[PDB]
Design an enzyme around this catalytic site. Structure first.
Site, short mmCIF file in Angstrom:
data_model
loop_
_atom_site.label_atom_id
_atom_site.label_comp_id
_atom_site.label_asym_id
_atom_site.label_seq_id
_atom_site.Cartn_x
_atom_site.Cartn_y
_atom_site.Cartn_z
CD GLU A 164 61.63 37.66 49.70
OE1 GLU A 164 59.91 37.53 49.79
OE2 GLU A 164 62.43 37.94 49.29
N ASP A 180 65.07 43.06 58.43
CA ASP A 180 64.71 43.48 57.10
C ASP A 180 64.78 44.70 56.05
N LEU A 203 57.84 39.02 61.41
CA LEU A 203 58.35 40.24 61.93
C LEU A 203 58.64 39.94 63.39
CG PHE A 256 54.37 35.69 51.02
CD1 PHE A 256 52.83 36.28 52.07
CD2 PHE A 256 54.36 34.66 51.47
CE1 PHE A 256 52.88 35.83 52.91
CE2 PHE A 256 53.88 33.87 52.65
CZ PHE A 256 52.95 34.17 52.76
CB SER A 274 46.80 38.66 35.18
OG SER A 274 47.59 39.43 34.55
CG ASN A 278 47.13 39.09 31.49
OD1 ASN A 278 46.78 39.90 32.04
ND2 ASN A 278 47.44 37.95 31.60
#
Ligand SMILES: *[C@@H]1O[C@H](CO)[C@@H](O[C@@H]2O[C@H](CO)[C@@H](O)[C@H](O)[C@H]2NC(C)=O)[C@H](O)[C@H]1NC(C)=O
Ligand SMILES: *[C@@H]1O[C@H](CO)[C@@H](O[C@@H]2O[C@H](CO)[C@@H](O)[C@H](O)[C@H]2NC(C)=O)[C@H](O)[C@H]1NC(C)=O
Ligand SMILES: CCCCCCCC/C=C\CCCCCCCC(=O)OC[C@H](O)CO
Ligand SMILES: CCCCCCCC/C=C\CCCCCCCC(=O)OC[C@H](O)CO
Ligand SMILES: CCCCCCCC/C=C\CCCCCCCC(=O)OC[C@H](O)CO
Ligand SMILES: CCCCCCCC/C=C\CCCCCCCC(=O)OC[C@H](O)CO
Ligand SMILES: CCCCCCCC/C=C\CCCCCCCC(=O)OC[C@H](O)CO
Lengths: 558, 28
Positions: free
Chosen positions: A241, A250, A262, A334, A347, A362
């Site tokens: 990130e 944001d 936040l 996230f 999965s 997969n």
């Protein structure tokens, strides 16, 4: 070079015997004419009388038997006394080597064969374990990881060393089992021989020996790296990130700092400053450091974990994961959100079933992989391998250069010196051989380097353990364990056998002391095999699972 | 000590063969 020296010296005797005989005067009485009975040189000898000449100088033990003599009787008929089957006969009984040495040699023959079967067993089982370990790592497709790639190459060096020792002993039987046919057979044996093969195999052994030292140094190097490079959940998301120290905005409009933390959903950026001060407890104007951001991020993960446990679809899979694979799950909650990751039903099921290989296939077949393939590749690797390897810079190219490049620098120059100035027997000679140090220098340098990194590793492991930073379950601890046992296991062996093999005087005591060292070291392949493959919990788990799929297959269906 | 053992062993095999060539010189 004794067989080579003797055949050259005997041919010289044979040549100069015929010349020495040519210059002799013709006889005046009944004589046994000048001969070379392929053993010694006889002149014109008068009838009845027995001739006596000194032992042939071509003999290897001539130095000792120098003053003694060989006899030959001349018949009263004029022709030399012949043997039982009318063969050239003579009394070279006092030209024979010491009766004491023949019995001692018969004793060394027994111990060389006895010691051979013993170390051949040790080398065979340590090689057997190695090939099985390489088969396992390869077969389970576990050779992708940087750790396993290192282990496989370490295994390869122990395979090369062990296998080339067996080839050398094998070729030595093949060569010395041959019979002394004629002089033609000896000429073909020495000159046009496979003495080259013996020596080619010796070079592979010498390279094997040094590469063992280098691949063990890269084990210590890779571990010293892993321990320093302490990758965590914060580190993977600082990559995935990105960290933002200043006050950013944001995608939705609201103010967000660091890793998407936040402060206020409202568009009031002035009020957001007073909200950020509440967390750390002091004014910061709008900027926070790395230590402040990771302490604040550790609240986001504690908040995301809480939600995953409250979620009926995510909690079964979350609990059936290690700290590393949990980080990969928390990572995709996230980017996707909680409800988003819950969509990966199929999965997540196989990720719970520990089927990491098909789970990774997969997970890459997902719409999420197409949108962000970069971030997906890393988390899909984390689920497949259970390691932070995807988030760490690899020095693997360097490790190949250290492991196989470094012995190359010393074995081929040695092999050239050997080829020109010391082209004798099989070239396996390792200590006080003049230029022995060409091959000993890289190993001395590797033990010295490996010693200092070991201390650094134990200094940094003790500190990380005292700081509760490393838990006994983290893969890094498990790797640290097998590496920090192997290094003192091999280290102590060197130290101990430096005093044990202090016997310089040639004998059976020296031979057994030499055998003691090499015998205990023959199992080394088995040591590296168990430590890096057979004792690996992940390898043990995959094999246990692939066996239960076999237990249902050919038993229930067939 | 592997190389040093294999060495002494081949030094032996060679000396053992050298004396066995002398047995060939004494019998033919
Ligand atoms: C005498 O000793 C030598 C051993 O080499 C031989 O004599 C030679 O005999 C050949 C014929 O076969 C002659 O052509 C040579 O001239 C001889 N050599 C010399 C230098 O005389 C032979 O084996 C022995 N017998 C006799 C009596 O000649
Ligand atoms: C080798 O044999 C010879 C025989 O020719 C030995 O020499 C003779 O020994 C007698 C002893 O009475 C002496 O007259 C001479 O030294 C030799 N005879 C002649 C007149 O030449 C010789 O001793 C033997 N060599 C050895 C020691 O093995
Ligand atoms: C597995 C064991 C392989 C066989 C043991 C060693 C062997 O039989 O060969 C060595 C020696 O040359 C025999 O005298
Ligand atoms: C495990 C197999 C044991 C090998 C023992 C063996 O075959 O012995 C060799 C023989 O004694 C050679 O002199
Ligand atoms: C797995 C490889 C087993 C090797 C068996 C073998 O042949 O042992 C060595 C040889 O017999 C003696 O020099
Ligand atoms: C760590 C070493 C601890 C025990 C090894 C004891 C080895 C026993 C050998 C005697 C010690 C010695 O001084 O070696 C001399 C050599 O044996 C003759 O030349
Ligand atoms: C443990 C290593 C065992 C070393 C074996 C040495 C040995 O067998 O000693 C032979 C001695 O010559 C008696 O005949």
């Amino acid at each position: 070079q004794v067989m080579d020296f003797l055949f050259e010296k005997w041919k010289l005797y044979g040549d100069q015997c015929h010349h020495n005989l040519s210059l002799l005067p013709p006889p005046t009485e009944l004589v046994c004419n000048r001969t070379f009975d392929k053993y010694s040189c006889w002149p014109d000898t008068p009838a009845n009388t027995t001739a006596n000449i000194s032992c042939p100088w071509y003999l290897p033990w001539h130095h000792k038997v120098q003053h003694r003599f060989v006899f030959k009787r001349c018949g009263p008929d004029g022709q030399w006394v012949r043997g039982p089957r009318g063969q050239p006969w003579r009394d070279a009984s006092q030209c024979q080597m010491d009766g004491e040495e023949i019995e001692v040699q018969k004793e060394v023959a027994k111990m060389y064969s006895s010691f051979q079967v013993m170390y051949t067993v040790g080398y065979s089982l340590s090689l057997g374990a190695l090939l099985l370990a390489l088969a396992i790592l390869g077969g389970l497709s576990k050779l992708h990881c940087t750790a396993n790639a290192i282990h496989a190459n370490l295994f390869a060096s122990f395979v090369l060393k062990a296998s080339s020792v067996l080839v050398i002993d094998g070729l030595l039987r093949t060569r010395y089992s041959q019979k002394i046919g004629d002089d033609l057979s000896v000429s073909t044996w020495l000159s046009d021989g496979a003495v080259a093969g013996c020596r080619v195999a010796a070079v592979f052994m010498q390279y094997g020996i040094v590469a063992n030292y280098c691949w063990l140094l890269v084990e210590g190097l890779y571990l010293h790296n892993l321990l320093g490079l302490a990758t965590n959940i914060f580190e993977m998301l600082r990559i995935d990130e990105g960290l933002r120290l200043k006050i950013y905005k944001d995608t939705e409009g609201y103010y967000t700092i660091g890793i998407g933390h936040l402060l206020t959903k409202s568009p009031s950026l002035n009020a957001a400053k007073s909200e950020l001060d509440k967390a750390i407890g002091r004014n910061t104007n709008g900027v926070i450091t790395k230590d402040e951001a990771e302490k604040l991020f550790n609240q986001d993960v504690d908040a995301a974990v809480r939600g995953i446990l409250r979620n009926a679809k995510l909690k079964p899979v979350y609990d059936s994961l290690d700290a590393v694979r949990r980080a990969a799950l928390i990572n995709m909650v996230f980017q996707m959100g909680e409800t988003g990751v819950a969509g990966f039903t199929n999965s997540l099921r196989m990720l719970q079933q520990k089927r990491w290989d098909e789970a990774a296939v997969n997970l890459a077949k997902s719409r999420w992989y197409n949108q962000t393939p970069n971030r997906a590749k890393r988390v899909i690797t984390t689920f497949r391998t259970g390691t932070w390897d995807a988030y760490e810079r690899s020095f693997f190219s360097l490790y190949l250069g250290i492991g196989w490049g470094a012995p190359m620098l010393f074995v081929v120059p040695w092999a050239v010196v050997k080829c020109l100035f010391e082209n004798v027997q099989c070239w396996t000679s390792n200590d006080n051989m003049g230029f022995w140090w060409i091959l000993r220098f890289p190993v001395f340098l590797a033990i010295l380097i490996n010693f200092f990194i070991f201390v650094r590793i134990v200094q940094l492991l003790v500190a990380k353990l005292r700081a509760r930073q490393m838990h006994h379950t983290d893969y890094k601890f498990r790797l640290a364990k097998s590496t920090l046992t192997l290094i003192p296991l091999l280290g102590v062996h060197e130290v101990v056998f430096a005093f044990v093999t202090d016997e310089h005087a040639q004998g059976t005591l020296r031979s057994a002391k030499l055998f003691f060292d090499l015998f205990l070291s023959s199992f080394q392949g088995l040591l590296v095999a168990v430590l890096y493959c057979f004792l690996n919990k992940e390898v043990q788990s995959e094999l246990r699972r692939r066996w239960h799929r076999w237990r249902l297959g050919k038993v229930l269906w067939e | 000590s592997q190389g040093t053992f294999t060495s002494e062993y081949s030094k032996y095999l060679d000396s053992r063969r050298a004396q066995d060539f002398v047995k060939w010189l004494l019998n033919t």
